[PDB]
Structures are given as structure tokens and as C-alpha cells.
């Protein structure tokens, strides 16, 4: 379902799966997508998150605190959570409603906030970033 | 959305198990090759078994090239950049052939198109040239 994803939006997902692999996690969840948005660095999502004071180490530290330690020999298959798949689907639906034929980093962050009830949304409101503020930051940076 | 088939998924699982068995710190192309043979049922397995590429023949050649590590890794094992390139080429191969899935046959095709890692070195040393492995897969399809 990544047909209209931009090269940097594709990069976001790649970094997400590499974070889940490094952190010894069994799924690619919404919080790994959030980490990938920050890791990408250059897109509208990364700039928006930086203007809100959301750092890579703060999200990663909050994620390890919630999930905890895993197995010594986990299964090598790391699929998306159903919640992360819904975020990706809502990313497409957000960009379609805006009249865009592409899906960039800003649409993935918007879709993440739209779902707004997983690990990523939980880590965001813990780091002092209410979800409605993240959306307005993304929208106001897309205006100019 | 995931394009990898169930058996291609099983190959990746076995590849991580195989690297941990050898106390290796990466999932390389040679562990992907061992996952193809370990899976057994797919097209890639039946092909390699035709060219005379046994499961112990590859494990033996891997031991001579790299050998056992000192400590067994814990958690997930990262892919080599070369193994990531193999998986990327497996997708490009399936797209060029007009398929929407990534099966074991596309993983072996992407493995030989990269053709410059431990797996490619092992295959040649076992007597199977890279172009001959490619055709045993294509005519089987």
C-alpha cells in the first residue's frame, strides 16, 4: 500500500523497522513509526516534532520503559501491529482528503495523530505534546 | 501490507535462527541462503537441491569462511547492508516479472543478482555458478 509514498516517507518506514529490530521488539508499532519520523530528519514531520521539543532519545527512553525486556531468541519476523497498519491506511486517507496524489512524512504524522490511541500517542502526551498541537504544527508548516 | 509469502517469511525466521546458531553478529546473505535450503518446500529449495547444494555443504563452507563466534547474540540480529540489498533486489525481481508477492524464488534471484557476498562465494565453491542457479529457478517457475 506504499504506491504513492515519497522516497522520504519510505525512508521513515525503513527506519521504523530497524528501530523495532534494535530494541528487541516483536512488531513494528506506532511508536516505531514515530521514531522513524524523527530519524528521517529532513521532512515536515521531523521539523514539526522538533519545534515541539520531541527528541529521539526521549521517545526511545519512554518506549523502552513501557515495553520492557524481551526474549533472548525472538522470532525473526517483525510485522506491523494492526494499529500501525491503520495509521498507514489513515495516512493515505489524510493525503487523499487534502487533494494530494503523494504521501509524505507529514501525512504519516497526521495519520498517526488521527489514530491517536497507541504507544506513539501515549509517548507524545507524556512528553508534553498534545495531539491537536502536533496537527496544527504540521498544518501551519505546510502553509508556508 | 506485506508482499513476502508465508514460506519467504519462514526463510527470514530460519535465517535469524541460523546466524544465532553460529554465534554470528549479522544476518548475512549466507544465512538467507541457509534459510532457503532449510525451508525445503519452496522453489528456491528444490532448485538448489537440483544443483547439488546441500544444507550441510553450505554450513560447512560457512564454517571455513567465518566460523563460530565466541558469544551467542541476544535479541534480534541485524541484517548486513548486503543482505538488505538482496531483499531489495528480491522485490525488484518480483516487480519486473509481473508478480505481486515475494516468494522464495525471488529471494534466490535477488541473492545471485547481488552476487558478491558470502553466499555467492559459497555457491561457486560448491560448484554452482551464479548464472546456472538463476536458470534452474526460471525454468522451474
Amino acid at each position: 500500500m506504499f504506491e504513492r509514498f515519497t522516497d522520504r516517507a519510505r525512508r521513515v518506514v525503513v527506519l521504523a523497522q530497524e528501530e523495532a529490530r534494535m530494541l528487541n521488539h516483536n512488531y513494528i508499532g506506532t511508536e516505531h513509526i514515530l521514531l522513524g519520523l524523527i530519524h528521517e530528519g529532513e521532512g515536515v514531520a521531523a521539523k514539526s516534532l522538533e519545534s515541539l521539543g520531541i527528541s529521539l532519545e526521549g521517545v526511545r527512553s519512554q518506549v523502552e520503559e513501557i515495553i520492557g525486556q524481551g526474549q533472548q531468541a525472538p522470532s525473526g519476523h517483525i510485522p506491523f501491529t494492526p494499529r500501525a497498519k491503520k495509521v498507514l491506511e489513515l495516512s493515505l486517507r489524510e493525503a487523499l482528503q487534502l487533494g494530494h496524489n503523494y504521501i509524505g512524512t507529514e501525512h504519516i504524522l497526521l495519520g498517526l495523530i488521527r489514530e491517536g490511541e497507541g504507544v506513539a500517542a501515549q509517548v507524545l502526551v507524556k512528553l508534553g505534546a498534545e495531539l491537536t498541537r502536533v496537527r496544527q504544527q504540521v498544518i501551519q508548516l505546510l502553509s508556508g | 501490507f506485506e508482499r513476502f509469502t508465508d514460506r519467504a517469511r519462514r526463510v527470514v525466521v530460519l535465517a535469524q535462527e541460523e546466524a544465532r546458531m553460529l554465534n554470528h553478529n549479522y544476518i548475512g546473505t549466507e544465512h538467507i541462503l541457509l534459510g532457503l535450503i532449510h525451508e525445503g518446500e519452496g522453489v528456491a529449495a528444490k532448485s538448489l537441491e537440483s544443483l547439488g547444494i546441500s544444507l550441510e555443504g553450505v554450513r560447512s563452507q560457512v564454517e571455513e569462511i567465518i566460523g563460530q563466534g565466541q558469544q551467542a547474540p541476544s535479541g534480534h540480529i541485524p541484517f548486513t547492508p548486503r543482505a538488505k540489498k538482496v531483499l531489495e533486489l528480491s522485490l525488484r525481481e518480483a516487480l519486473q516479472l509481473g508478480h505481486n508477492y515475494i516468494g522464495t524464488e525471488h529471494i534466490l534471484l535477488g541473492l545471485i543478482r547481488e552476487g558478491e557476498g558470502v553466499a555467492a562465494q559459497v555457491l561457486v565453491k560448491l560448484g554452482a555458478e551464479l548464472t546456472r542457479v538463476r536458470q534452474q529457478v526460471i525454468q522451474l517457475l
Partner: peptide
């Protein structure tokens, strides 16, 4: 698992 290198 996504595979875009």
C-alpha cells in the same frame, strides 16, 4: 518487513 534498501 519492507525491502527498499
Amino acid at each position: 518487513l519492507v525491502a527498499w534498501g
